[PDB]
Design an enzyme around this catalytic site. Structure first.
Site, PDB file in Angstrom:
ATOM      1  N   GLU A   4     -50.848  26.117  24.769  1.00  0.00           N
ATOM      2  CA  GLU A   4     -51.112  24.707  24.495  1.00  0.00           C
ATOM      3  C   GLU A   4     -49.790  23.959  24.365  1.00  0.00           C
ATOM      4  O   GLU A   4     -48.860  24.442  23.712  1.00  0.00           O
ATOM      5  CB  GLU A   4     -51.930  24.590  23.206  1.00  0.00           C
ATOM      6  CG  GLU A   4     -53.247  25.326  23.324  1.00  0.00           C
ATOM      7  CD  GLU A   4     -53.988  25.502  22.013  1.00  0.00           C
ATOM      8  OE1 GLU A   4     -53.598  24.835  21.016  1.00  0.00           O
ATOM      9  OE2 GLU A   4     -54.976  26.268  22.029  1.00  0.00           O
ATOM     10  N   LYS A  41     -49.816  28.785  20.321  1.00  0.00           N
ATOM     11  CA  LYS A  41     -51.036  29.494  20.621  1.00  0.00           C
ATOM     12  C   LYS A  41     -51.422  30.313  19.394  1.00  0.00           C
ATOM     13  O   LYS A  41     -50.568  30.963  18.808  1.00  0.00           O
ATOM     14  CB  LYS A  41     -50.854  30.441  21.822  1.00  0.00           C
ATOM     15  CG  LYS A  41     -52.132  31.122  22.298  1.00  0.00           C
ATOM     16  CD  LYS A  41     -53.105  30.159  22.975  1.00  0.00           C
ATOM     17  CE  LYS A  41     -54.467  30.757  23.232  1.00  0.00           C
ATOM     18  NZ  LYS A  41     -55.222  30.814  21.948  1.00  0.00           N
ATOM     19  N   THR A  42     -52.700  30.226  18.999  1.00  0.00           N
ATOM     20  CA  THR A  42     -53.255  31.104  17.986  1.00  0.00           C
ATOM     21  C   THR A  42     -53.867  32.318  18.674  1.00  0.00           C
ATOM     22  O   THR A  42     -54.219  32.322  19.876  1.00  0.00           O
ATOM     23  CB  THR A  42     -54.375  30.371  17.211  1.00  0.00           C
ATOM     24  OG1 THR A  42     -55.333  29.951  18.176  1.00  0.00           O
ATOM     25  CG2 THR A  42     -53.892  29.168  16.450  1.00  0.00           C
ATOM     26  N   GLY A  43     -54.079  33.381  17.882  1.00  0.00           N
ATOM     27  CA  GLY A  43     -54.835  34.522  18.354  1.00  0.00           C
ATOM     28  C   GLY A  43     -55.506  35.243  17.175  1.00  0.00           C
ATOM     29  O   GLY A  43     -54.943  35.305  16.095  1.00  0.00           O
ATOM     30  N   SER A  44     -56.703  35.765  17.427  1.00  0.00           N
ATOM     31  CA  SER A  44     -57.447  36.525  16.423  1.00  0.00           C
ATOM     32  C   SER A  44     -58.156  37.684  17.085  1.00  0.00           C
ATOM     33  O   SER A  44     -58.710  37.554  18.185  1.00  0.00           O
ATOM     34  CB  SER A  44     -58.445  35.649  15.748  1.00  0.00           C
ATOM     35  OG  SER A  44     -57.793  34.758  14.878  1.00  0.00           O
ATOM     36  N   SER A  74     -55.826  36.496  21.151  1.00  0.00           N
ATOM     37  CA  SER A  74     -55.698  35.503  22.226  1.00  0.00           C
ATOM     38  C   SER A  74     -54.252  35.223  22.620  1.00  0.00           C
ATOM     39  O   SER A  74     -54.010  34.704  23.702  1.00  0.00           O
ATOM     40  CB  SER A  74     -56.401  34.225  21.881  1.00  0.00           C
ATOM     41  OG  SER A  74     -57.775  34.485  22.113  1.00  0.00           O
ATOM     42  N   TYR A  90     -63.134  26.843  26.417  1.00  0.00           N
ATOM     43  CA  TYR A  90     -62.258  27.982  26.185  1.00  0.00           C
ATOM     44  C   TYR A  90     -63.048  29.260  26.404  1.00  0.00           C
ATOM     45  O   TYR A  90     -64.175  29.383  25.917  1.00  0.00           O
ATOM     46  CB  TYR A  90     -61.717  27.875  24.754  1.00  0.00           C
ATOM     47  CG  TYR A  90     -60.712  28.928  24.355  1.00  0.00           C
ATOM     48  CD1 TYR A  90     -59.528  29.111  25.059  1.00  0.00           C
ATOM     49  CD2 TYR A  90     -60.932  29.717  23.232  1.00  0.00           C
ATOM     50  CE1 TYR A  90     -58.620  30.095  24.683  1.00  0.00           C
ATOM     51  CE2 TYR A  90     -60.024  30.693  22.843  1.00  0.00           C
ATOM     52  CZ  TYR A  90     -58.843  30.854  23.546  1.00  0.00           C
ATOM     53  OH  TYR A  90     -57.950  31.807  23.127  1.00  0.00           O
ATOM     54  N   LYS A 128     -53.186  36.084  26.019  1.00  0.00           N
ATOM     55  CA  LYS A 128     -53.376  35.203  27.181  1.00  0.00           C
ATOM     56  C   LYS A 128     -52.028  34.673  27.681  1.00  0.00           C
ATOM     57  O   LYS A 128     -51.941  34.291  28.830  1.00  0.00           O
ATOM     58  CB  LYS A 128     -54.331  34.032  26.889  1.00  0.00           C
ATOM     59  CG  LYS A 128     -55.763  34.463  26.508  1.00  0.00           C
ATOM     60  CD  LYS A 128     -56.592  33.290  26.040  1.00  0.00           C
ATOM     61  CE  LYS A 128     -58.052  33.712  25.961  1.00  0.00           C
ATOM     62  NZ  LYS A 128     -58.371  34.577  24.776  1.00  0.00           N
TER      63      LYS A 128
END
Ligand SMILES: *[B@]([O])([C]N1[C]=C([C][N]S(=O)(=O)C2=[C][C]=C([C])[C]=[C]2)N=N1)OP([O])([O])=O
Length: 355
Positions: free
Chosen positions: A269, A309-312, A61, A147, A64
């Site tokens: 965010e 921001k997190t992402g996985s 993510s 989301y 993004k």
């Protein structure tokens, strides 16, 4: 005092490897225009290949943020307006119900009827078009945040159309070079495949992300720790960058609406700084990530801001955070997912201890 950065990262990130059985990790800190890169473990268990500055990780993510930057770039070039609707660009959607949603609402997940994922059955270009043509509203447009990969994926597709190039080329030929990134990719070329980490799933099997509908704008970028530090540097210090990308970056920092203590910017965010640990953790709660939430207008406009921001992906975990006023930021890349809370907490302790 900078001699402490390595020690802090060792104290707070390194134990997560053992705790979650993570093969490899790269943690970077940037402070006052100086980069610190800390590498742990293996990019490939089977190959016994070490994580290093050439290791390519899936950003999930965090991809993004590039889509949002591409949107900011196209807006500042006059190629789109955030008030436009998708049908202005994707002609087949003109005069359909989704053509009542504006590009900002797509980018910021407020169409009122788009979930985290497309349906599993939606795969081909044709199925994607049909999905969007058949779309009908549910919640009042603009009012609820859910989301959504499809939502920002459509945003990215429209950005690409506006620039008359496929989305992969928007990033690889326009946005990444403008940011000075040398090893960031939508499609990792043959000559870099040796550098592409394996991800590892929850059964410790090596895995990489599978192609999916509008994957590139939602979760499809891959990058190295040095490139992500350069990206954070651009976010902290846009003055050095070309005017066009500078405006694009600024565009991504503008909060659009609030959900209590979380402000939704473009991709990023945003929070008031300093933020409590619980503020940062709750931004990735089940309630915020997985359920619809009615948004409000920004009431308190934070004077001093921080962004994350997190992402996985199936086999990779990412976290990126920066604080302009303190001139500091941090990137964590792992080739196995660990809980968001651990990523956020570790970063919190480190950035607070350096502050
Ligand atoms: B983005 O990357 C969007 N995102 C996250 C997910 C969850 N998929 S996963 O976490 O990669 C996963 C894969 C396989 C299994 C068995 C569990 C989980 N889907 N889209 O990340 P965020 O951090 O949520 O903003």
């Amino acid at each position: 005092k900078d001699q402490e950065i390595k020690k802090l990262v060792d104290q707070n990130f390194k134990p997560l490897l053992e705790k979650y059985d993570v093969p490899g990790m790269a943690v970077g800190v940037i402070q006052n225009n100086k980069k610190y890169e800390m590498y742990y473990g293996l990019q490939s268990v089977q190959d016994k290949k070490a994580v290093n500055s050439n290791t390519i990780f899936e950003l999930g993510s965090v991809s993004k943020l590039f889509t949002a930057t591409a949107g900011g770039y196209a807006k500042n070039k006059g190629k789109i307006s955030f008030d436009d609707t998708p049908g202005k660009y994707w002609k087949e959607l003109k005069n359909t119900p989704i053509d009542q949603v504006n590009l900002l609402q797509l980018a910021t997940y407020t169409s009122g009827n788009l979930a985290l994922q497309f349906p599993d059955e939606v795969q081909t270009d044709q199925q994607v078009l049909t999905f969007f043509k058949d779309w009908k509203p549910k919640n009042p447009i603009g009012e609820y945040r859910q989301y959504s990969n499809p939502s920002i994926g459509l945003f990215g597709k429209v950005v690409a159309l506006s620039m008359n190039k496929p989305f992969d080329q928007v990033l690889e030929k326009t946005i990444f070079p403008a940011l000075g990134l040398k090893h960031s990719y939508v499609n990792v070329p043959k000559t870099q495949m040796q550098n592409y980490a394996f991800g590892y799933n929850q059964e410790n099997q090596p895995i990489r992300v599978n192609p999916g509908p509008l994957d590139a704008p939602a979760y499809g970028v891959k990058s190295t720790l040095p490139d992500m530090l350069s990206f954070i540097h651009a976010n902290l210090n846009p003055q050095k960058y070309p005017t066009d990308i500078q405006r694009a970056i600024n565009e991504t920092h503008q909060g659009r609406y609030q959900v209590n203590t979380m402000y939704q910017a473009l991709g990023w965010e945003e929070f008031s700084y300093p933020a409590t640990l619980q503020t940062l953790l709750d931004s990735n709660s089940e309630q915020i990530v997985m359920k619809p939430n009615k948004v409000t207008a920004i009431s308190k406009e934070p004077s001093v801001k921080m962004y994350h921001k997190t992402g996985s992906t199936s086999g990779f975990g990412t976290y990126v955070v920066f604080i302009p006023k303190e001139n500091i930021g941090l990137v964590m890349l792992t080739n196995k997912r660990i809980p968001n809370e651990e990523r956020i907490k570790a970063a919190y302790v480190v950035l607070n201890a350096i502050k």
